[PDB]
Enzyme design. Structure first.
Site, short mmCIF file in Angstrom:
data_model
loop_
_atom_site.label_atom_id
_atom_site.label_comp_id
_atom_site.label_asym_id
_atom_site.label_seq_id
_atom_site.Cartn_x
_atom_site.Cartn_y
_atom_site.Cartn_z
N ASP A 36 94.36 3.56 -20.73
CA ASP A 36 93.56 4.14 -22.31
C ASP A 36 92.18 3.67 -22.15
O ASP A 36 91.67 3.31 -22.74
CB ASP A 36 93.79 3.69 -23.49
CG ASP A 36 93.83 3.92 -24.22
OD1 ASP A 36 93.20 4.81 -24.50
OD2 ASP A 36 94.06 2.51 -25.40
N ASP A 220 89.32 10.27 -23.79
CA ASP A 220 90.25 9.66 -24.42
C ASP A 220 91.65 10.14 -23.77
O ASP A 220 92.24 10.31 -24.06
CB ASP A 220 90.43 9.25 -25.13
CG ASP A 220 92.25 8.12 -26.11
OD1 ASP A 220 91.59 7.38 -25.48
OD2 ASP A 220 92.04 8.07 -27.81
#
Ligand SMILES: COc1cccc(-c2cccc([C@@H]3C[C@@H]3c3cc(=O)n(C)c(N)n3)c2)c1
EC number: 3.4.23.46
Length: 361
Positions: A36, A220
């Site tokens: 992440d 992201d």
């Protein structure tokens, strides 16, 4: 330049993100861990939640150290909370090193673990500024660079079960074609970048570029979609709507329902370049923003927290998180899914003036 042991070290399921195998504790406990770039905590299941294949058992680790501090992380539908400590961590299919890292042992959660998923934790690769409880909790990558000779960069090739590569400490030139083009990391919190121009099928949206970054744009790996500020999403869809007026309901464009390539336009984001008045552009295909569910979801959506270049963008490109030089490199991915007519692209240089004005303050 070449890191064969790390190639293909990512797995996942479409819409569910990409995970890498890690070990925690002594002797090593294996877990699958979501990669992440949109958060900064290393957190792992530590209790027998019924959806978990496995979990961190601190009682079995001789190297475990308790920090005696809680951490509580609510996010958007919904939450994880845990107990902070440290322990020895390695990445079997990463660099040949073991480091002492902060680990949040997850002891309560809501909507976090997914019924039927094959991962047990999350690896936040972004910066300390957005770590919880606060920026004094050193992120994993910061610990890795500090304790070893691993260079301060990593790169991602997300391929779209999906697969991919996380190259820790370098770049693998077999993962991309053409040249890398770099955009500055605007500020080290999220991986924040500045979009200076948007074209749909080569047609400029004519919007004040400041809107493209309202109130930020980030890269992201922890988001599936390309997410845009509503104002931008409105114009984007209106244009994406027009380009494809040849052959779908209003709810579709809202991700409220599903629909079951050439009709659809390419999307180019021009990014701030390395040189004053210089930019480059990255171009994606419908194969990127139309993701299989032959029913697909429209994987461009709206946002209150700015542009999010999620897997839809990243699966088109090899992405280099060049932390050492405060920049992110994009190149055409060697695995990206294209047809025989159109191909994802990274092109430059272009002349774009007033790019500094595109950043929101
Ligand atoms: C959808 O695929 C992924 C891939 C990697 C991580 C995650 C993920 C799923 C649920 C929770 C979290 C942590 C709260 C952190 C978080 C919240 C969040 O809203 N985003 C967009 C990101 N990138 N991370 C991360 C999800």
């Amino acid at each position: 330049g070449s890191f064969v042991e790390m190639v293909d070290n990512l797995r996942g399921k479409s819409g569910q993100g990409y995970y890498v195998e890690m070990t925690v504790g002594s002797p090593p406990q294996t877990l699958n861990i979501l990669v992440d770039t949109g958060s900064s905590n290393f957190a792992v299941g530590a209790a027998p939640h019924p959806f978990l294949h496995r979990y961190y058992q601190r009682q079995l680790s001789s190297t475990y150290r308790d920090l005696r501090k809680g951490v509580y992380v609510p996010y958007t539908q919904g939450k994880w909370e845990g107990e902070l400590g440290t322990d020895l961590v390695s990445i079997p299919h990463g660099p040949n090193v073991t480091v002492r890292a902060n680990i949040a042992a997850i002891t309560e959660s809501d909507k976090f673990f997914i019924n039927g998923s094959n991962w047990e934790g999350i690896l936040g690769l972004a910066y300390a500024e957005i770590a919880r409880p606060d920026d004094s909790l050193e992120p994993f990558f910061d610990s890795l660079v500090k304790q070893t000779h691993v260079p301060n960069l990593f790169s991602l090739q997300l391929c779209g079960s999906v697969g991919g590569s996380m190259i820790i400490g370098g770049i693998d030139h077999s993962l991309y074609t053409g040249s890398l083009w770099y955009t500055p990391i605007r500020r080290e919190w999220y991986y924040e970048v500045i979009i200076v121009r948007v074209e749909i099928n080569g047609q400029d949206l004519k919007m004040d570029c400041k809107e493209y970054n309202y109130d930020k744009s980030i890269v992201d790996s922890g988001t599936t979609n390309l997410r845009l500020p509503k104002k931008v999403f409105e114009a984007a869809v209106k244009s994406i709507k027009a380009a494809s007026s040849t052959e779908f309901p209003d709810g579709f464009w809202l991700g409220e329902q599903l629909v079951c390539w050439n009709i659809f336009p390419v999307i180019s984001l021009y990014l701030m370049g390395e040189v004053t008045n210089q930019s480059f552009r990255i171009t994606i295909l419908p194969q990127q923003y139309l993701r299989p569910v032959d029913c697909y979801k429209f994987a461009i959506s709206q946002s209150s927290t700015g542009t999010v270049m999620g897997a839809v963008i990243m699966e088109g490109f090899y992405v280099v998180f060049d932390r050492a030089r405060k920049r992110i490199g994009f190149a055409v991915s060697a695995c990206h899914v294209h047809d025989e007519f159109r191909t994802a692209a990274v092109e430059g240089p272009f002349v774009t003036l007033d790019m500094e004005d595109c950043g929101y303050n």
